[PDB]
Design a protein around this motif. Structure first.
Motif, PDB file in Angstrom:
ATOM      1  N   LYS A  94      54.439  37.725  48.691  1.00 44.66           N
ATOM      2  CA  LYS A  94      53.834  36.399  48.835  1.00 44.66           C
ATOM      3  C   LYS A  94      52.375  36.465  48.396  1.00 44.66           C
ATOM      4  O   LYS A  94      51.910  35.658  47.618  1.00 44.66           O
ATOM      5  N   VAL A  95      51.657  37.460  48.909  1.00 45.14           N
ATOM      6  CA  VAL A  95      50.229  37.612  48.618  1.00 45.14           C
ATOM      7  C   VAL A  95      49.996  37.910  47.142  1.00 45.14           C
ATOM      8  O   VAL A  95      49.182  37.363  46.431  1.00 45.14           O
ATOM      9  N   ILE A  96      50.758  38.871  46.637  1.00 48.78           N
ATOM     10  CA  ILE A  96      50.492  39.265  45.255  1.00 48.78           C
ATOM     11  C   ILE A  96      50.873  38.112  44.333  1.00 48.78           C
ATOM     12  O   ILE A  96      50.206  37.842  43.351  1.00 48.78           O
ATOM     13  N   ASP A  97      51.942  37.387  44.632  1.00 41.52           N
ATOM     14  CA  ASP A  97      52.349  36.305  43.762  1.00 41.52           C
ATOM     15  C   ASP A  97      51.344  35.157  43.778  1.00 41.52           C
ATOM     16  O   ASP A  97      51.167  34.467  42.771  1.00 41.52           O
ATOM     17  N   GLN A  98      50.706  34.959  44.941  1.00 40.40           N
ATOM     18  CA  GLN A  98      49.762  33.844  45.109  1.00 40.40           C
ATOM     19  C   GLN A  98      48.389  34.169  44.536  1.00 40.40           C
ATOM     20  O   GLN A  98      47.714  33.331  43.957  1.00 40.40           O
ATOM     21  N   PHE A  99      48.013  35.441  44.715  1.00 39.03           N
ATOM     22  CA  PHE A  99      46.654  35.827  44.381  1.00 39.03           C
ATOM     23  C   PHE A  99      46.557  36.855  43.276  1.00 39.03           C
ATOM     24  O   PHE A  99      45.451  37.257  42.908  1.00 39.03           O
ATOM     25  N   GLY A 100      47.688  37.301  42.737  1.00 38.69           N
ATOM     26  CA  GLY A 100      47.655  38.365  41.734  1.00 38.69           C
ATOM     27  C   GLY A 100      47.322  37.798  40.367  1.00 38.69           C
ATOM     28  O   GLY A 100      47.399  36.582  40.200  1.00 38.69           O
TER      29      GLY A 100
END
Ligand SMILES: CCN(C(=O)c1cc(C)cc(OC[C@H](C)Nc2ccncc2)c1)C(C)C
Ligand SMILES: [Ca+2]
Ligand code: NA
Lengths: 28, 10, 252
Positions: free
Chosen positions: C245-251
């Motif tokens: 979730k984090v990497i997809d949102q902020f990567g």
């Protein structure tokens, strides 16, 4: 893609001193 | 005890 | 690491040292999961009972290291943090449930012989490898004893422990987001993580595809290498939806 493959070990087909101990624990 | 790192990183 | 051994050069090229900018000190371990993302324990960054609450500019990450204290010129790389992401449900009040955090680096780190990312497990990886008796490897530059400090990165291999034994070893409530590892007293062998090793990786080498997977993160323990106590590790796969979730949102 190449995650988890160490340049000084898996990429050169060299084993570290204790990875065999791990393998021996992986009984299936 | 820790060696100083280069300036660039601080 | 208590009762481990010196690492070989390039043995853990995903190992990351979290370094406090000032005063210059080892804070924690961490791991490299891509050219801009580092994985660690939430309690390395946030633990109010000990007045711990770090922000991005308080820390650096040091990648490619072997020596604990030297600046390993032309080998290590030092990165700044763009942003910390702590699991929103990290339970620091009770038992460090969901003890996980991601750190995005300001710039991509170049891979080298000494710097390379670890894989994260998928469901099948976890099912296949996260079994009692199966051994993983913990690495770090933390204390050598509960009560010196190593010159170089230390390593120890430790077996995953049956969940009822883990539960029966402590008064703390265990969750499905944790596992424990270590030898039992009757097993004769020793080893544990210790102070300074928090946040580092617990890795396993898949016998199916020859790749190293980070199955755990060094979380909490009661003492270090005490008989009948086990170290606890954050279960990475159980938290993978959050990681993704984090990497997809902020990567990038
Ligand atoms: C028992 C209560 N707690 C801790 O004392 C504790 C709180 C924190 C913030 C860290 C910690 O252990 C850190 C330690 C370095 N972790 C180890 C992991 C495996 N083996 C030994 C130590 C232990 C937590 C909330 C369960
Ligand atoms: Ca108990
Ligand atoms: Na123990």
């Amino acid at each position: 893609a190449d995650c988890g493959l160490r340049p000084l070990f898996e990429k050169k087909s060299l084993e570290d001193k204790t990875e065999r101990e791990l393998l021996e624990s992986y009984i299936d | 005890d820790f060696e100083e790192i280069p300036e660039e990183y601080l | 690491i208590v009762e481990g051994s010196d690492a070989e050069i390039g043995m853990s090229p995903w190992q990351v040292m979290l370094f406090r900018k000032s005063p210059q000190e080892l804070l924690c371990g961490a791991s490299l999961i891509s050219d801009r993302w580092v994985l660690t324990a939430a309690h390395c960054l946030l633990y109010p009972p000990w007045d711990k609450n770090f922000t991005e500019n308080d820390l650096l990450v040091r990648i490619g290291k072997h020596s604990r204290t030297r600046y390993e010129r032309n080998i290590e790389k030092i990165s700044m943090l763009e942003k910390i992401y702590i699991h929103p449900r990290y339970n620091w009040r009770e038992n460090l449930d969901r003890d996980i955090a991601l750190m995005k680096l300001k710039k991509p780190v170049a891979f080298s012989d000494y710097i390379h990312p670890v894989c994260l497990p998928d469901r099948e990886t976890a099912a296949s490898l996260l079994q009692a008796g199966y051994k993983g490897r913990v690495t770090g530059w933390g204390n050598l004893k509960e009560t010196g400090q190593p010159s170089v990165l230390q390593v120890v291999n430790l077996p995953i422990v049956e969940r009822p034994v883990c539960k029966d070893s402590t008064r703390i409530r265990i969750t499905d987001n944790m596992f424990c590892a270590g030898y039992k007293p009757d097993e004769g062998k020793r080893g544990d993580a210790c102070e300074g090793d928090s946040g580092g990786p617990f890795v396993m080498k898949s016998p199916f595809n020859n790749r190293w997977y980070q199955m755990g993160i060094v979380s909490w323990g009661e003492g270090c290498d005490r008989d009948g106590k086990y170290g606890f590790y954050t279960h990475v796969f159980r938290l993978k939806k959050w990681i993704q979730k984090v990497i997809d949102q902020f990567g990038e």
